[PDB]
Design a protein that fits this description.
Chain lengths: ~325, ~325
């Protein structure tokens, strides 16, 4: 995967010079979004799909929230460079132009867009039954951040406070592993802690736009990280410094997954494990930050930045990533 | 397909108010790209995938042109509102991370981006074998257009000259019909007019950024249309006025398709039939427009706009769409 992707990454970096010194000149690839120089401001650009979670939605005929996942994936990435999300286009590659599915998808697209404060301004619909075994939903979002107000993690210093905002659940990463491990063993209707397995797998991703925009307009912020592919390893994209964390207890779907063989170190590398978004602020602003975030979502002090470069220590679990 | 899409379109229109009176306020859905009000200028945004052409690519192992198809699909759409393409992200949804496939894909991505003058600033790579029976490659492009320089077709009037720029071949629409009709009977190694069928089907989509940007900066232009899904029906997106046209002779892959039982009136609603891009100019600019475009690609005077609303007459073929 990394060897295959490197070919595209290297080609992409080569094309940067086509906009050198011109409107749209990019920064480097690697962060949660691209930053494009528009003179007075940066434009942020990101793209992501929902993933195989759509296979669960199709099974129970509930696409009412897949659109929330898609918008969440994209606007939460815009936040991680300090950008205010503005607009989105959706790429909907489907096996069939089913009017019932499309009606369900539209409902969540509105709900997500409302929560994020963005307009859905266009898109593409590709009926490709030979290529698509379901209803793949992806999107591309753009946002804006003023020059001088970009947050990429370069300000992170040892001793900074690390705060986690709770997730709504599995969100949109690790779905294939969870599906193949749990569905054939327990059945989609398996009731676990009052919710069916498909209810655990379909829980829409949380949208962090409002608490994070409030936070960056109120306190000093040194880093912002959506916990997606790679789980806690996403923190290393922000800085070479280390992290000393205490993660919340494993429960819900994550407990179920863990009890079915998956080791905890792999799980902190795959699932958000209850923390959907992480902010890094100076210790001076920790209490103020907790209060702003905790108005909107249950939020924790996870730990501190350390000088153990490149290491993430989950102390209460005896794990280093 | 139209009724299913109506659900998302109406919902996306409802989200416009979330950006009303703000940076990024959108125009209406329906055109080749969306236009977002950034004050001194509009930002153009569009997204599109390659389509089932990637299935032919996988069948024969030739992947170094679908990356051109993806970039062409998106930058040619930005041209159709008068915008200069700036930047693109790509969405690569794959059954597996085959390093050979990704190396080929990156070659075409570089060639396309260099021809269009865009930087590939980021992207997404998603391995989902349960969902994707191949290598689905899509993208999202961003462009810029000044206030008062947008070209939508609103200025098209009866009498206007209609000019077509030759396509390189099938481009990226109608591939599903072409696949199911030709591949079982002939196979991808069948030679037609000195070229293998896979050479016909994988010829990369032409990029029109250079001739079109030169054109709108030189003469008055009333309409621009990439000839994609629905073939010549795309002209009806620019205006309700009619068209009287003389289309090029049916040659190459289109003749082979026609001769295998596809009627001519269906082919003009599916394939570009040799015309990849159409521009509408006032008669007084016709010669100068032909001159600029002929410096880049073979270009034709196709005909004129008429007062026979809602119809496209292909006179030399006796067809009315
Ligand atoms: N196919 C691609 N083409 C170009 N850039 C890509 C591609 N895939 C990934 N990238 C870039 O590589 C970096 C890492 O990508 P990715 O791992 O998708 O980040 P993410 O979106 O934060 N994680 P996730 O939401 O789990 O996919 C980003 O800056 C992307 O822009
Ligand atoms: N899933 C979608 N969500 C939102 N808008 C959409 C969606 N699909 C299509 N649209 C919009 O509907 C209009 C027509 O779409 P489309 O038929 O894809 O245009 P095109 O890209 O010019 N043609 P093609 O290249 O053949 O796909 C555009 O303005 C799109 O932005
Ligand atoms: K991203
Ligand atoms: K488009
Ligand atoms: Mn992401
Ligand atoms: Mn399209
Ligand atoms: Mn298109
Ligand atoms: Mn991604």
């Amino acid at each position: 995967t990394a060897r295959a992707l490197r070919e595209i990454i290297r080609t992409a970096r080569e094309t940067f010079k086509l906009r050198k010194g011109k409107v749209g000149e990019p920064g480097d690839i690697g962060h949660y979004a691209a930053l494009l120089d528009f003179g007075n401001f940066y434009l942020a650009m990101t793209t992501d799909g929902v993933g195989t979670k759509v296979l669960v939605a199709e099974a129970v005929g509930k696409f009412d929230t897949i659109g929330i996942d898609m918008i969440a994936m994209n606007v939460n990435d815009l936040l991680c460079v300090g950008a205010e999300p503005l607009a989105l286009v959706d790429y909907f590659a489907v096996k069939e132009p089913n009017e019932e599915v499309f009606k369900q998808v539209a409902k969540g697209l509105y709900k997500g867009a409302e929560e994020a404060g963005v307009a859905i301004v266009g898109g593409e619909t590709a009926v490709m039954p030979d290529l698509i075994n379901g209803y793949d939903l992806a999107g591309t979002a753009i946002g804006i951040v003023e020059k001088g107000k970009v947050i990429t993690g370069e300000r992170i210093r040892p001793g900074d406070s690390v705060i986690g905002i709770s997730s709504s659940g599995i969100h949109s990463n690790g779905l294939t592993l969870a599906r193949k491990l749990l569905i054939p063993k327990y059945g989609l209707d398996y009731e676990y802690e009052g919710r069916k397995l498909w209810e655990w797998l379909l829980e829409p991703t949380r949208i962090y736009v409002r608490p994070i925009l409030e936070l960056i307009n109120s306190v000093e912020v040194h880093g912002l990280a959506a916990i997606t592919g790679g789980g806690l390893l996403n923190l290393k994209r922000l800085t070479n410094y280390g992290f000393e964390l205490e993660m919340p207890p494993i429960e819900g779907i994550f407990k179920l997954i863990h009890e079915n063989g998956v080791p905890l170190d792999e799980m902190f590398r795959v699932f958000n494990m209850g923390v959907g978004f992480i902010v890094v602020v100076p210790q001076e602003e920790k209490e103020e930050a907790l209060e702003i975030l905790s108005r909107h979502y249950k939020s924790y002090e996870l730990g501190n930045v350390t000088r153990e470069l490149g290491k993430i220590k989950v102390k209460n679990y005896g794990i280093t990533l």
